[PDB]
A paper describes a structure:
Here we investigated the aminopeptidase, [name] aminopeptidase ([name]) from [name], which is highly abundant in the biofilm matrix. [name] is associated with biofilm development and contributes to nutrient recycling. We confirmed that post-translational processing was required for activation and [name] is a promiscuous aminopeptidase acting on unstructured regions of peptides and proteins.
We determined the elegant regulatory mechanism whereby the C-terminal propeptide region of [name] binds in a groove between the protease and protease-associated (PA) domain, blocking access to the active site pocket. The C-terminus is a propeptide sequence that binds between the PA and peptidase domains, inducing a closed inactive conformation where the active site is occluded. Although [name] shows substantially increased activity after C-terminal tail removal, full-length protein is catalytic active, with lower kcat. It is likely, therefore, that the full-length protein is sampling open (active, C-terminal tail away from the active site) and closed (inactive, C-terminal tail occupying the active site) conformations when free in solution.
Numbering used by the authors: 36 to 510, 526 to 536
């Protein structure tokens, strides 16, 4: 294996590692890479993944817990029940009456993530539609929408206003056999397919699929229409875990919290996504055992993020109000080793994309911006509309920030000039795939972003004054993780 050099002598000074000048120098990329190799090995021993409710995830939990305990931490493994969702094969959709049509998988229609399986054929009944440009559909949002609905029918429901889960559960309570949700069509951009979910909490029991706007319109204009609908999936009630630890030292009423989800997708080992955030954060926690922070630092490794941020969301929701209020800031680290990386910082002040985090998120962003500038490196903004485990912290008004090296987006010519790599190719062409292994890590990306992680965590562990100032001066959700919830 490739050893790094021994840590410079400043790394045993409890003073120097308590500062944003010492902590990053002590966080060596070579040491993070060895933790990434261990997670790669854990994946190889457990069918090639570290997904929620697998032995690969359990062995990941064991490794994080053991490492933390070796550093003196008391570790809290926090279990929670969790309904897993497994897509088995492609879906089927065809009209039988008044004429036979076969519709095209992943062009005409697609699954709602977290749907139940099903094989049904029934009359299709449109429910409270509002077609046409500029509409503000509330189709299926209210129980009264279904006063007309004849049980056993397939509900044809238009996207709009409320969550897909709400639409589908209302349809179920009215005795629908299945649900077809079609894109709203209120603008010419909302007429295709989308990545959409009915959520891990879905209790409707019937299958739910998504379709194009012009399909839903045509089906709504077909009297006596019957569709043959097949969804090939499985859902199972299981258990997974978050791993939480915090420093003994530090003010427990002004907690700086850092998080990184520990699960992979089922399709691969998840080494960049998100072994990289998990491993870098673990190395930092080990170093911070020696520090003398002013503010307590809490570390979290989240379960089941790939199922829609289930672990992180559950942790925040379960805090008593007095406990929630002790968390001054949350820092999220999800994918920081992308092979074709850019240097992306969460756009906390909304300067790039128009969405602002809770007060104090702008100051956290400015600290990340400062570190990259300090190092002679470029950086730029990335979106913060509830795509990662900061989402419930965001929803709760807690200041947050984070770093990102890029996923399925394509690198521009300008970004290639700023960061190197290849313009025209994804930041991580192996995102959510089998090839997201140890070989998929860019160690340059991983080093600068771990250093930047250490810098801002250290800073806030000494003083949250920049967050506190923005909080004093200050005195909808379409996405939740990978998919849209409405
Ligand atoms: Na309605
Ligand atoms: Zn991730
Ligand atoms: Zn992911
Ligand atoms: Zn910004």
């Amino acid at each position: 294996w490739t050893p790094g050099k021994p840590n410079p002598s400043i790394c045993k000074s409890p003073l120097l590692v308590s500062t944003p000048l010492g902590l990053p120098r002590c966080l060596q990329a070579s040491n993070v890479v060895k933790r990434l190799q261990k997670l790669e090995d854990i994946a190889s021993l457990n069918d090639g993944n570290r997904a929620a409710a697998t032995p690969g995830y359990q062995a990941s939990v064991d490794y994080v817990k053991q490492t933390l305990q070796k550093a003196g931490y008391k570790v809290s493994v926090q279990p929670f029940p969790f309904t897993a969702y497994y897509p088995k094969g492609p879906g089927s959709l065809s009209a039988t009456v008044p004429q036979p049509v076969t519709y095209e998988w992943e062009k005409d229609f697609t699954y709602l993530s977290q749907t139940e399986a099903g094989d049904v054929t029934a009359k299709v009944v449109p429910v409270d539609l509002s077609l046409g440009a500029g509409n503000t559909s509330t189709s299926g949002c209210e129980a009264e929408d279904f006063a007309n609905f004849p049980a056993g029918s397939i509900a044809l429901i238009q996207r709009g206003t409320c969550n897909f889960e709400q639409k589908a559960e209302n349809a179920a309570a009215a005795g629908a056999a299945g649900v077809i949700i079609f894109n709203q069509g209120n603008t010419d951009d909302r007429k295709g397919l989308e990545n959409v979910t009915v959520g891990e909490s879905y209790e409707g029991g019937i299958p739910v699929i998504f379709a194009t706007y012009d399909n839903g319109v045509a089906w709504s204009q077909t009297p006596d229409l019957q569709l043959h609908l097949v969804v090939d999936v499985v859902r199972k009630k299981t258990e997974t875990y978050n791993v939480v630890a915090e420093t003994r030292r530090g003010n427990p009423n002004n907690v700086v919290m850092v998080g990184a989800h520990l699960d992979s997708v089922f399709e691969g080992p998840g080494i960049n996504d998100n072994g990289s955030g998990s491993a870098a954060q673990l190395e930092m926690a080990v170093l911070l055992a020696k520090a003398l922070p002013v503010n307590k630092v809490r570390f979290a490794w989240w379960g089941a993020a790939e199922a829609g941020l289930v672990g992180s969301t559950h942790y925040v929701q379960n805090l008593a109000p007095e406990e929630k209020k002790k968390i001054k800031a949350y820092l999220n680290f999800d994918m920081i080793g992308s092979p074709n990386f850019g240097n992306f910082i969460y756009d906390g002040d909304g300067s790039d994309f128009g969405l602002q985090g809770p007060p104090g998120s702008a100051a956290i962003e400015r600290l990340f911006e400062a570190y990259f500038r300090l190092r002679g490196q470029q950086s730029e903004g990335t979106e913060i509309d509830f795509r990662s485990d900061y989402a419930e912290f965001f929803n709760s008004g807690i200041a947050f920030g984070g770093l990102f090296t890029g996923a399925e987006g394509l690198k521009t010519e300008e970004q290639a000039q700023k960061y190197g790599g290849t313009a025209g190719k994804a930041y991580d062409e192996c995102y959510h795939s089998k090839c997201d292994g140890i070989a998929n890590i860019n160690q340059d990306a991983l080093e600068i972003h771990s250093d930047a992680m250490a810098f801002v965590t250290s800073w806030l562990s000494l003083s949250t004054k920049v967050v506190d100032d923005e909080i004093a001066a200050a005195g909808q959700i379409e996405r939740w993780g990978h998919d849209f919830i409405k």
